[PDB]
Amino acid sequence: KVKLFRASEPILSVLMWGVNHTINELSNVPVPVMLMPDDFKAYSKIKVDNHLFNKENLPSRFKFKEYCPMVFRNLRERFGIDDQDYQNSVTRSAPINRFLTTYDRRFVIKTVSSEDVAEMHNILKKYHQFIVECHGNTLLPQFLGMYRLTVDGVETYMVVTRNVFSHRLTVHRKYDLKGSTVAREASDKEKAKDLPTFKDNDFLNEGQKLHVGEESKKNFLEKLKRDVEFLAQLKIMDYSLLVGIHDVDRAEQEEMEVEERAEDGPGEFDPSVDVYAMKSHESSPKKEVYFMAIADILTTVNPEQYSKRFNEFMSNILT
Template sequence: NCAVASNNQFEESFLPQEGHSEFKGTHFSFSFDDEAFSADNTKFSVTCYFARQFAALRKKCCPGDIDYIRSLSRCKRWSAQGGKSNVYFAKTMDERFIIKQVTKTELDSFIGFAPHYFRHLAESLTSRSPTCLAKIMGLYQVNIKGLKGGREVKMDLMVMENIFFQRTISRVYDLKGSVRSRYNSDTSGHNKVLLDSNLIEAQHTNPIFLGSKAKQRMERAVWNDTSFLASLDVMDYSLLVGVDERKNELVIGIIDFLRQYTWDKQLETWVKASGILGGSKNEAPTVISPVQYKKRFRKAMSRYFLAVPDDWSSS
């Protein structure tokens, strides 16, 4: 969990003095050899995108860069439930961070709106305005050349905070505010990721209650972040929810917020809404606009969690 800045130094390290000119040249690249990895002439190169801005964020959200490097130095492959099967996921051995491979489209999307992302976080942390974005702590491109057969490996990787770090989570939900194809019939095993329809089903027997103030704060955070994401034409994000029954707390974070509403998604929305390919026009299309997605998301998150009074009285 991030510490909250008490002065303006954090914000100034993010925000441009004039436009976004200071974001130019903020990517840092370096190359090296590693004989311990390979006796061949294998070359490694790493590009750190927005190095200064991410360093400023980590300064407020992490114990320190040495600890950050130490965490990343020991990782294990991780099969993230609900994620795309062909996408590389890893988790640091201390479980503090999650590493996810991003597509070129996602990378280009983030680079395009990165100044707004850093501004949003800076303003949220300095003003103590509620936010529930799962924070991206670093963005890198790793390139390995000179492998056997002349192969070259290039991967774009995003480092995210693990919002369940040091938590005992008994139930996990990935919520989008829709019930279309949002039911996981396989609920066996530990920490299976359940979906919207699973939560609605559980409301009859095992609902999630929030105190009035906690629900207001959650709704305010969702409102702030969805307003921000819609302004960038971002959609298809989820609210990741973990139930920590040991501490009797709900842990939440908005994830997967790199997908922007491009022209192909606009076309897909129009085709499905028009019924050209068959099906009912009365059903909402699976792909909707960012503004529609925001409104649906807000309503659903408010409806999913039931509020109870913070103070009970006999009167």
């Protein structure tokens, strides 16, 4: 039951230690009837200066700050994430590859700028209220924690989200879509990578389509509508639709080759866990799973119109 907080970088150990630390302290804090306004300006801060002690994995000296912990605890709850699960995902083993995933691929940890952290505060009261009135049903990023780590006098800002992708199903192709009239494509650099991040004209040029079926398309499009309208209400623009594609047969084969090396359920998922996943329509050219979520809402044409434009595009991404 010993947790060592062992990691490739001291930053990771401190991250593991702080999530572990704060989740445990929160376990000693009654769950409130409601969130008070201060909760939105609140934060916790701990500074550690150990001497000749417990220095194998943690640095002797570091700081950890959690923004607005009462609010994020509540967000986790409304997103149906149990605090102990969250803690275990982060601390049972070092997050792996600034962009990390928890070792079990449930949670994504992004290193952000100070400005990003500033925007979360700005948007936080309304985002919460919006998560309340849409019952956690949303294509928006789902925020679970915000933290500032300090190691060797250096401050690092981090935001934890639920993975847009499945924690279990492989992605075989992703796109970052915006719907911009501007040319959007992948550099020769990108296309050369393993899992390139294709863009608008790649999607349009490939003739790609996402066969989800009318009932999913409608539910999807109703989410997209209020999400982008909510974002337009704030001063927010230039976010993307992150699209991941999972080829069910290709995976079955990949798995089969995986076991072969040892010797020598099929494209389904828990919609409560892989929250952005959608099956293909029974009459799809091939058996697929899609993951679709709005990306990057923190960091001519104005907002209101973007939501209008962004919206028309994603409505045409599918059938």
